A paper describes a structure:
A glutamine synthetase-like (GS-like) enzyme (NpaA1) initiates 1NA glutamylation, and this enzyme exhibits a broad substrate selectivity toward a variety of anilines and naphthylamine derivatives. During γ-glutamylation of 1NA, the 1NA consumption (0.16 mmol) was almost equivalent to the total accumulation of γ-glutamylated 1NA (0.157 mmol). In view of the above analyses, NpaA1 was established as a γ-glutamylnaphthylamide synthase catalyzing ligation of 1NA and L-glutamate to form γ-glutamylated 1NA. The crystal structure of apo-NpaA1 and two complexes with substrates or substrate analogs were obtained. The binding pocket is located at the interface between adjacent subunits, and the bifunnel channel similar to GS protein refers to a structural feature characterized by two distinct channels that converge into the common active site.
The model of NpaA1 built by Alphafold2 was used as the template for a molecular replacement for apo-NpaA1. The crystal structure of apo-NpaA1 revealed that there are six monomers arranged as a hexamer in an asymmetric unit. In apo NpaA1, there are two Mn2+ ions binding to the active center, coordinated by glutamic acid and histidine residues.
Author numbering:
A (entry chain D): 6 to 87, 96 to 495
B (entry chain F): 6 to 417, 423 to 495
Write the structure that this text describes.
C-alpha cells in the first residue's frame, strides 16, 4: 500500500474512493481513465480496467515521465537516455475528482498526482504547483475564487490529416486537421448565431451539465465561429481541475460528432480573431467565507484587493510565459484589440491588463486579469494569479492609477514575444522560484526556450511581430492539440 | 437583490418569475436565452443555465455595450477603449450594463432543444436605465401616451422573402473582417410569382411555411393571415391587433421566430426590403394604428358623419405627417429601404393623407361609427427596428394631438418624403426637437452619428450615382442586410 504508507490520502479521499468504486459497480463501468496535466495542459495517462483501478487505489500505477521532456511535437529537449533520463513515477489517483464521461462508452475518469517511488512529490507536476499555491494562500488566511470564462473556436472537420504523408516525425510537426467555420459574423452576441450552431452546441452544453460542471452562459463571441462558455465561481484546486475537464470535454465531444474545438489563441484561418481567457479572481476569508475584495464608498476595491491588483500588475511580466504559454498567444500583445499590451488597471475598460468589476458593497466585486490565453495550463495560469497577487498583498504594492485610456497609458509595457516573456522571468527569477520551485523554473526556462528556437528557424524573427500574420508553424504546433 | 433594490419589477413581474421558474422546472428546460434589441432591432444577448437564470432574477446579468457602438459589420463607430466622464456627452468606452430579465416575455422556443427565452432591459449598474436601449425608448412613448389617457393599438402587416439556401457562405474567404462585409448567403427562390394571392403558391410553400405557422402559433403570437405576395417567393404575414409594449415585443419575436425556424430547415427568411436577386420587388411593413381610451377601452378614432376620422384621429394623422420626414430613418433605417420606386408599382413616397391613393404615406380606413376606424402608415420597411418604428408613430402622432395639427384634405404640390437614408438623416437633424425630447437627446446624436457613417460606407463603396434611389440594388446593400435582417 504505497498510498497508505506514504500518507497520500485524507479520510475524505479514502471514503471518496470507497464511493467511486460503488458508483463504478452500479453504473457498470468497464474502463476508468487516469490522467494528469503535463507542462502544456495536455491530459496524459492510462485507461485502466476496474480490476486495475482497485489495485491503483493501493499501489498507484507506474508511468514514465517522458511527456515532461518532450515538446508538443516530440523533440527531446532533455536527454532521456543517461534533468535527464526517464525515471518511472507513480500515478496516485485522487478519487474526489472522479467523473463519469458521458460521451464515452462505459468509461469513468479521474485525475492523478505524480510521485517519485520514494513518495515525495514529482517537482514538474503542474497540478502540484497549484496545490503549493493554494496551501500557501491557506496559511495567509485566504481562499482563491475563480470564474472561468473561455473563448474558443468551433469548426466542422473536413479532413482529419491521417494520411502517412501528414504524420510528421519527432520534431517534425504533423499537418493541421482541416476545418471549416460553422458560422460567420462579426456581429457580437447575436442570438441567431447561437441557434445556428446549437446543433452541435447543444451536445457540448448537455455534456458539461452531465459532468455536474457549473456552466453559467453560452455566448456568441465576436469573431466568425468564435464562442464563449462561462462558468460560475469555483474555489481553489477545484477550479483548475474544472478548467482542465471543461477544455477536454469540449474538445472530445466536438470530435465524436465530427467537429474541431481549438483553444489555440489565434488560428491561421482568415477571419479568425484572437481568443482570450480572462480570469475573474477574488479572495475570500478561509474562516468567514466572505469576499475580502468588497470595496466601500470611494474605493473600487478593498485595500486587500487593491494589493492583490498591485502584485498582479507588478508580476504580470515575469508571469507572462505562464498566462501566455504559446508563441501564437502573443499576437494578443497588441493595441486596439480588446487585449492588454501593457500593465494597466482600470474599472470597466477592456483595453487594460487588470479590469475591476466591482460596486460598493457588491459581494461579487473581483478582478479580471485579461493577459490570459485560452490554451494556457489551468494550473500554471491560476497559480500564477495566486502567486502574483499574494505578493502584492505581502508587499503592499500600490497598483498605481486607474487608467482612462490604457492604450495611452505610460505604464510599463507587456512582453510581445514568448522569448520576451521568458527573458522577463529570467531577470525576475524569485517568487516563482520560491513558489513554483527552483527546479521547475530551470526546467521551464530550458524547455520553452527550445520551442522559441524552433519557431525562429522555421519562420524567422520578423514573423514574430504580434501584428503579423499567423504563421504555419503556429498552426502546426497548436491547432490540433490545443 | 439588484432588482428589488431599484424596484425594477412590479408585483406582476414578480407573480410571473415564480411561475417562469415553475414551468422551467415542469418542462425540464436547460437553457434560457436572455436577449435584447440593439439599435438595429437585432436580438443580442446570452444563453443562461437554469442555475444561472435563477441568479439573474435577483442580480441581473452583465453585458458590454459594444453592439451599440458597432456597425452591422462591426466597424467601431465610437472609441471603445477610453472610459468616459459623462458618457452621455462624449459617447466612449465599453461600460458593463446589467440585463434585467422581464418575466412577462417568457417563451419556450419550439424549434430549439429545451431552451427558453425572455427579453432584458439594459440598466447602468447605478440602477438607472441605459440611454440607448430601444425598448426603453418604446417604454417612454407608452408612458407619455398613458399620461395623456391613450393606449397604442397596433396592427402588423409584414412582408418578407422565403428562399432555399444553396450555400451558407462559410468558407474562410467569405467571413469578412471587422468593418468588412461578409459574403451573402447564396439562395434560390421557392415559388414563381407575379400572380398575386395565388392559392397554389401558398400550398406550394407550405412544407416549410407550415413549420413557421406552427411555430408562431405555439408562441401564442396572434397570427392573422399568411398571404402570397406579388413578387416571386415573397410572402406577407399579418397579425391581429396588439397593444403598446406587447406589440413591439411580439414584432421582434415574430421576425426572430421566422428566421430561426426557416434556417433550421435549410431556408433563408429575410427582412431586407429589396434583395439583389432577379425579380424580387420591395417588401413593406404597413402598420395600422389607433388610440383607445385607457379606462373605457374604446376606439377614439371612430368618426361621426361628415369627417373621415374623429378630430383626435385627424390630429394624430397630422402629427404622423408633419414629422414623417424626420421619422423616416426610424421607419426606413436601411439604405436599401428606399429602393421602393419601380416601373410597375406605387410607393408611398408622398407625405400625404388619402383613402385610395397608393402614393400617400398614410391610408385611412374609416366608416362612420365603425369601431375599427384607424389609420395605416406604409413607409415602414420590414427590416425596421420594432421599438423605434412603433415609438416613432406614437411620438409623431402625439405631437399632432397635443398641437391639433391639421392633416388637410385627403389626396385622392404634394410634399414629398426623403428618398434616401441620407435625406432621412438630413430631415431628422434639422427637425430634431420632438425626437430629441421624447427619444432622448443622447440617443438622437448617437443615432445621427452612427447612421451618417453607415451612409459614407455605402457611398464609398458604390459611388454617388448608384446611391440614387431609382437604381438597382447594389452589392453593398446585399452584403449589408441580406443575411442579418
Ligand atoms: Mn468575452
Ligand atoms: Mn402588400
Ligand atoms: Mn395594407
Amino acid at each position: 500500500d504505497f498510498i497508505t504508507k506514504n500518507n497520500l490520502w485524507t479520510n475524505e479521499q479514502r471514503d471518496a474512493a470507497d464511493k467511486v468504486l460503488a458508483e463504478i459497480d452500479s453504473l457498470g463501468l468497464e474502463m476508468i481513465r487516469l490522467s494528469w496535466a503535463d507542462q502544456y495542459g495536455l491530459l496524459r495517462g492510462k485507461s485502466l480496467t476496474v480490476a486495475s483501478l482497485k489495485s491503483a487505489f493501493k499501489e498507484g500505477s507506474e508511468v514514465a515521465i517522458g511527456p515532461f521532456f518532450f515538446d508538443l511535437v516530440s523533440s527531446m529537449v532533455f536527454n532521456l537516455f543517461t534533468l535527464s533520463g526517464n525515471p518511472t513515477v507513480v500515478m496516485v489517483p485522487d478519487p474526489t475528482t472522479f467523473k463519469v464521461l458521458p460521451w464515452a462508452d462505459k468509461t469513468g475518469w479521474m485525475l492523478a498526482d505524480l510521485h517519485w517511488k520514494s513518495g515525495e512529490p514529482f517537482p514538474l507536476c503542474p497540478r502540484g504547483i497549484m496545490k503549493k499555491a493554494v496551501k500557501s494562500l491557506s496559511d495567509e488566511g485566504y481562499l482563491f475564487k475563480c470564474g472561468i470564462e473561455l473563448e474558443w473556436y468551433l469548426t466542422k472537420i473536413v479532413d482529419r490529416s491521417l494520411s502517412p504523408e501528414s504524420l510528421g516525425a519527432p520534431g517534425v510537426q504533423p499537418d493541421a486537421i482541416q476545418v471549416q467555420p460553422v458560422a460567420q459574423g462579426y456581429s457580437v452576441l447575436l442570438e441567431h448565431h447561437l441557434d445556428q450552431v446549437d446543433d452541435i452546441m447543444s451536445k457540448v452544453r448537455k455534456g458539461l451539465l452531465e459532468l455536474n460542471l457549473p456552466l453559467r452562459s453560452i455566448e456568441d463571441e465576436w469573431a466568425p465561429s468564435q464562442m464563449e462558455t462561462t462558468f460560475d465561481v469555483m474555489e481553489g484546486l477545484e477550479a483548475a481541475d474544472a478548467a482542465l475537464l471543461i477544455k477536454s470535454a469540449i474538445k472530445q465531444i466536438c470530435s465524436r460528432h465530427g467537429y474541431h474545438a481549438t483553444f489555440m489563441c489565434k488560428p491561421a484561418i482568415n477571419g479568425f480573431f484572437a481568443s482570450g481567457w480572462h480570469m475573474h479572481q477574488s479572495l475570500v476569508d478561509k474562516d468567514t467565507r466572505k469576499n475580502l475584495f468588497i470595496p466601500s464608498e470611494g474605493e473600487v476595491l478593498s485595500p486587500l484587493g487593491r494589493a492583490y491588483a498591485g502584485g498582479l500588475l507588478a508580476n504580470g511580466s515575469a508571469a507572462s510565459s505562464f498566462t501566455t504559454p504559446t508563441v501564437n498567444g502573443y499576437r494578443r500583445r497588441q493595441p486596439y484589440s480588446l487585449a492588454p499590451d501593457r500593465r494597466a488597471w482600470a474599472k470597466d475598460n477592456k483595453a487594460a491588463m487588470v479590469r475591476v468589476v466591482s460596486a460598493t458593497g457588491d459581494p461579487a466585486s473581483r478582478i479580471e486579469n485579461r493577459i490570459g490565453e485560452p490554451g494556457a495550463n489551468p494550473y500554471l495560469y491560476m497559480a500564477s494569479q495566486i502567486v502574483s497577487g499574494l505578493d502584492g498583498i505581502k508587499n503592499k504594492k500600490d497598483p498605481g492609477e486607474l487608467q482612462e485610456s490604457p492604450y495611452d497609458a505610460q505604464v510599463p509595457m507587456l512582453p510581445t514575444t514568448l522569448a520576451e516573456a521568458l527573458d522577463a522571468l529570467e531577470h525576475d527569477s524569485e517568487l516563482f522560484r520560491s513558489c513554483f520551485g527552483d527546479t521547475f523554473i530551470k526546467y521551464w526556462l530550458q524547455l520553452r526556450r527550445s520551442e522559441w528556437a524552433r519557431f525562429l528557424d522555421a519562420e524567422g524573427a520578423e514573423a514574430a511581430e504580434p501584428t503579423g500574420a499567423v504563421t504555419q508553424w503556429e498552426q502546426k504546433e497548436y491547432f490540433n492539440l490545443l
